[PDB]
Design a protein around this ligand. Structure first.
Ligand SMILES: Cc1ccc(-c2cc(=O)c3ccccc3o2)cc1
Ligand SMILES: [Zn+2]
Lengths: 47, 161
Protein backbone atom coordinates (compact mmCIF):
# COMPACT_ATOMS: atom_id res chain seq x y z
CA UNK A 1 0.00 0.00 0.00
CA UNK A 2 1.17 3.59 -0.70
CA UNK A 3 1.30 6.41 1.85
CA UNK A 4 -0.88 9.44 2.16
CA UNK A 5 0.72 12.65 0.94
CA UNK A 6 2.91 14.22 3.65
CA UNK A 7 0.67 16.06 6.10
CA UNK A 8 -2.58 14.27 4.98
CA UNK A 9 -4.71 11.19 5.95
CA UNK A 10 -6.51 10.32 2.70
CA UNK A 11 -7.00 11.45 -0.86
CA UNK A 12 -10.24 12.82 -2.27
CA UNK A 13 -10.85 12.21 -5.92
CA UNK A 14 -12.95 15.23 -6.89
CA UNK A 15 -14.77 14.61 -10.16
CA UNK A 16 -13.56 17.35 -12.60
CA UNK A 17 -15.47 16.26 -15.79
CA UNK A 18 -18.67 14.19 -15.14
CA UNK A 19 -20.99 16.69 -13.62
CA UNK A 20 -23.15 13.92 -12.14
CA UNK A 21 -20.35 11.87 -10.53
CA UNK A 22 -20.04 11.96 -6.80
CA UNK A 23 -16.65 11.95 -5.09
CA UNK A 24 -14.48 8.94 -4.51
CA UNK A 25 -11.96 8.52 -1.69
CA UNK A 26 -8.81 6.59 -0.90
CA UNK A 27 -7.30 5.64 2.44
CA UNK A 28 -3.90 4.01 2.90
CA UNK A 29 -4.65 2.23 6.18
CA UNK A 30 -7.31 -0.46 6.57
CA UNK A 31 -8.03 0.91 10.04
CA UNK A 32 -9.62 4.06 8.62
CA UNK A 33 -12.76 2.15 7.45
CA UNK A 34 -15.44 -0.06 9.06
CA UNK A 35 -17.83 -2.22 6.94
CA UNK A 36 -21.15 -1.32 8.66
CA UNK A 37 -23.85 -2.73 6.36
CA UNK A 38 -24.05 -5.73 4.06
CA UNK A 39 -26.66 -5.18 1.39
CA UNK A 40 -27.90 -8.16 -0.71
CA UNK A 41 -29.63 -7.13 -3.90
CA UNK A 42 -30.42 -7.69 -7.50
CA UNK A 43 -30.04 -5.02 -10.10
CA UNK A 44 -33.44 -4.64 -11.82
CA UNK A 45 -33.97 -4.76 -15.59
CA UNK A 46 -35.44 -1.39 -16.64
CA UNK A 47 -39.01 -1.77 -17.96
CA UNK B 1 -16.14 -12.53 15.61
CA UNK B 2 -18.50 -11.14 12.98
CA UNK B 3 -22.25 -11.60 13.31
CA UNK B 4 -24.86 -10.42 10.77
CA UNK B 5 -28.21 -9.06 12.00
CA UNK B 6 -31.07 -8.77 9.48
CA UNK B 7 -32.94 -5.51 9.43
CA UNK B 8 -36.70 -5.61 8.84
CA UNK B 9 -38.02 -3.61 5.87
CA UNK B 10 -40.22 -1.91 8.47
CA UNK B 11 -37.15 -0.50 10.27
CA UNK B 12 -36.18 3.13 9.64
CA UNK B 13 -32.56 2.10 9.44
CA UNK B 14 -33.36 -0.42 6.68
CA UNK B 15 -35.29 2.32 4.97
CA UNK B 16 -32.51 4.97 5.22
CA UNK B 17 -29.78 2.61 3.96
CA UNK B 18 -32.10 1.42 1.11
CA UNK B 19 -32.65 5.10 0.27
CA UNK B 20 -28.85 5.89 0.15
CA UNK B 21 -28.48 2.81 -1.99
CA UNK B 22 -31.34 3.64 -4.41
CA UNK B 23 -30.81 7.41 -4.57
CA UNK B 24 -27.08 7.33 -5.36
CA UNK B 25 -27.49 5.16 -8.50
CA UNK B 26 -26.12 7.07 -11.48
CA UNK B 27 -25.37 6.16 -15.07
CA UNK B 28 -21.76 5.19 -15.67
CA UNK B 29 -19.50 6.16 -18.49
CA UNK B 30 -19.08 2.53 -19.47
CA UNK B 31 -22.76 2.15 -20.48
CA UNK B 32 -23.18 -0.52 -17.77
CA UNK B 33 -20.31 -2.70 -18.93
CA UNK B 34 -18.65 -3.21 -15.56
CA UNK B 35 -21.76 -3.23 -13.39
CA UNK B 36 -24.81 -3.92 -15.53
CA UNK B 37 -27.76 -1.94 -16.86
CA UNK B 38 -30.18 -0.80 -14.18
CA UNK B 39 -31.77 2.28 -12.64
CA UNK B 40 -32.59 0.75 -9.30
CA UNK B 41 -32.15 -2.33 -7.20
CA UNK B 42 -34.40 -5.05 -5.79
CA UNK B 43 -33.10 -4.98 -2.25
CA UNK B 44 -33.41 -8.55 -0.94
CA UNK B 45 -31.73 -8.11 2.47
CA UNK B 46 -29.85 -5.49 4.56
CA UNK B 47 -27.71 -6.75 7.42
CA UNK B 48 -25.78 -4.86 10.06
CA UNK B 49 -22.17 -6.12 10.39
CA UNK B 50 -21.15 -6.39 14.05
CA UNK B 51 -17.50 -7.08 15.02
CA UNK B 52 -16.13 -5.53 18.21
CA UNK B 53 -12.42 -5.93 17.48
CA UNK B 54 -12.72 -4.42 14.01
CA UNK B 55 -14.83 -1.53 15.38
CA UNK B 56 -12.28 -0.64 18.05
CA UNK B 57 -9.45 -0.84 15.53
CA UNK B 58 -11.46 1.73 13.52
CA UNK B 59 -12.20 4.12 16.44
CA UNK B 60 -8.54 4.07 17.65
CA UNK B 61 -7.25 5.28 14.33
CA UNK B 62 -10.13 7.74 14.08
CA UNK B 63 -8.94 9.48 17.28
CA UNK B 64 -5.30 9.72 16.10
CA UNK B 65 -6.46 11.31 12.87
CA UNK B 66 -8.78 13.67 14.73
CA UNK B 67 -5.99 14.87 17.03
CA UNK B 68 -3.67 15.59 14.08
CA UNK B 69 -6.50 17.67 12.50
CA UNK B 70 -8.01 20.06 15.08
CA UNK B 71 -10.32 17.38 16.45
CA UNK B 72 -11.94 16.57 13.14
CA UNK B 73 -11.97 12.95 11.88
CA UNK B 74 -13.89 14.01 8.80
CA UNK B 75 -15.97 10.80 8.79
CA UNK B 76 -18.22 9.69 5.93
CA UNK B 77 -20.59 6.82 5.00
CA UNK B 78 -19.43 5.41 1.70
CA UNK B 79 -20.01 2.32 -0.47
CA UNK B 80 -17.53 -0.41 -1.22
CA UNK B 81 -17.97 -3.23 -3.73
CA UNK B 82 -15.54 -6.14 -3.71
CA UNK B 83 -15.12 -9.79 -4.55
CA UNK B 84 -13.58 -9.96 -1.09
CA UNK B 85 -16.73 -8.79 0.76
CA UNK B 86 -16.80 -12.05 2.74
CA UNK B 87 -13.17 -11.65 3.89
CA UNK B 88 -13.73 -7.94 4.64
CA UNK B 89 -16.72 -8.48 6.87
CA UNK B 90 -14.88 -11.17 8.81
CA UNK B 91 -11.27 -9.88 8.88
CA UNK B 92 -11.49 -6.11 8.24
CA UNK B 93 -9.93 -4.03 5.48
CA UNK B 94 -6.21 -4.45 4.85
CA UNK B 95 -3.57 -4.19 2.10
CA UNK B 96 -5.06 -7.28 0.37
CA UNK B 97 -8.22 -5.28 -0.43
CA UNK B 98 -6.31 -2.35 -1.93
CA UNK B 99 -6.71 -1.31 -5.52
CA UNK B 100 -3.03 -1.53 -6.46
CA UNK B 101 -3.72 0.02 -9.85
CA UNK B 102 -5.98 2.78 -8.52
CA UNK B 103 -5.53 6.31 -9.86
CA UNK B 104 -4.60 7.77 -6.49
CA UNK B 105 -2.10 5.01 -5.66
CA UNK B 106 -2.33 1.61 -4.02
CA UNK B 107 -4.97 2.21 -1.34
CA UNK B 108 -8.54 1.18 -0.48
CA UNK B 109 -11.20 2.91 -2.51
CA UNK B 110 -14.73 4.04 -1.55
CA UNK B 111 -17.60 5.72 -3.41
CA UNK B 112 -20.49 8.09 -2.74
CA UNK B 113 -22.31 6.50 -5.70
CA UNK B 114 -23.56 2.98 -4.87
CA UNK B 115 -23.61 2.18 -8.61
CA UNK B 116 -19.83 2.92 -8.69
CA UNK B 117 -19.08 0.36 -6.01
CA UNK B 118 -21.49 -2.04 -7.88
CA UNK B 119 -18.87 -2.09 -10.65
CA UNK B 120 -16.32 -3.83 -8.40
CA UNK B 121 -18.64 -6.47 -6.88
CA UNK B 122 -17.51 -9.07 -9.44
CA UNK B 123 -13.92 -7.70 -9.65
CA UNK B 124 -12.05 -4.73 -11.15
CA UNK B 125 -13.95 -3.85 -14.30
CA UNK B 126 -16.70 -6.26 -13.12
CA UNK B 127 -14.48 -9.29 -13.79
CA UNK B 128 -16.36 -11.94 -15.79
CA UNK B 129 -19.69 -11.14 -14.15
CA UNK B 130 -21.67 -13.51 -11.96
CA UNK B 131 -20.24 -16.95 -11.13
CA UNK B 132 -23.35 -18.77 -12.47
CA UNK B 133 -24.18 -17.09 -15.77
CA UNK B 134 -20.89 -15.20 -16.37
CA UNK B 135 -23.06 -12.12 -16.79
CA UNK B 136 -21.89 -8.68 -15.51
CA UNK B 137 -25.53 -7.54 -15.92
CA UNK B 138 -27.23 -10.61 -14.38
CA UNK B 139 -30.74 -9.85 -13.13
CA UNK B 140 -31.19 -13.22 -11.43
CA UNK B 141 -28.11 -13.69 -9.30
CA UNK B 142 -27.74 -12.08 -5.85
CA UNK B 143 -25.09 -9.39 -5.27
CA UNK B 144 -23.61 -7.77 -2.18
CA UNK B 145 -22.29 -4.26 -1.40
CA UNK B 146 -20.86 -2.77 1.76
CA UNK B 147 -22.04 0.58 3.13
CA UNK B 148 -19.01 1.69 5.23
CA UNK B 149 -17.85 4.22 7.82
CA UNK B 150 -14.66 5.96 6.64
CA UNK B 151 -12.21 8.39 8.31
CA UNK B 152 -10.73 10.90 5.85
CA UNK B 153 -9.01 13.39 8.22
CA UNK B 154 -7.00 15.96 6.21
CA UNK B 155 -7.77 14.80 2.74
CA UNK B 156 -5.46 15.71 -0.11
CA UNK B 157 -7.77 17.18 -2.72
CA UNK B 158 -7.05 15.84 -6.18
CA UNK B 159 -9.06 17.36 -9.02
CA UNK B 160 -9.40 14.68 -11.72
CA UNK B 161 -11.15 13.17 -14.75
C1 LIG C 1 -9.38 -5.24 -5.81
C2 LIG C 1 -10.32 -4.17 -5.69
C3 LIG C 1 -10.12 -2.97 -6.39
C4 LIG C 1 -11.03 -1.91 -6.30
C5 LIG C 1 -12.18 -2.00 -5.49
C6 LIG C 1 -13.05 -0.88 -5.43
C7 LIG C 1 -14.24 -0.83 -4.68
C8 LIG C 1 -15.01 0.32 -4.65
O1 LIG C 1 -16.13 0.28 -4.09
C9 LIG C 1 -14.56 1.45 -5.37
C10 LIG C 1 -15.26 2.66 -5.35
C11 LIG C 1 -14.80 3.76 -6.08
C12 LIG C 1 -13.65 3.68 -6.87
C13 LIG C 1 -12.95 2.47 -6.89
C14 LIG C 1 -13.40 1.38 -6.15
O2 LIG C 1 -12.67 0.21 -6.17
C15 LIG C 1 -12.37 -3.21 -4.78
C16 LIG C 1 -11.46 -4.26 -4.88
ZN1 LIG D 1 -26.21 -14.78 -12.82
Amino acid sequence: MAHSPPGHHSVTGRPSVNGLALAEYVIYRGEQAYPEYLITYQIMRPE
Amino acid sequence: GTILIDLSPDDKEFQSVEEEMQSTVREHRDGGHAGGIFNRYNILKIQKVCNKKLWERYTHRRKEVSEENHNHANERMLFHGSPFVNAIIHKGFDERHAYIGGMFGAGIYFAENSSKSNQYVYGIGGGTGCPVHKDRSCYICHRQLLFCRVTLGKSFLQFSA
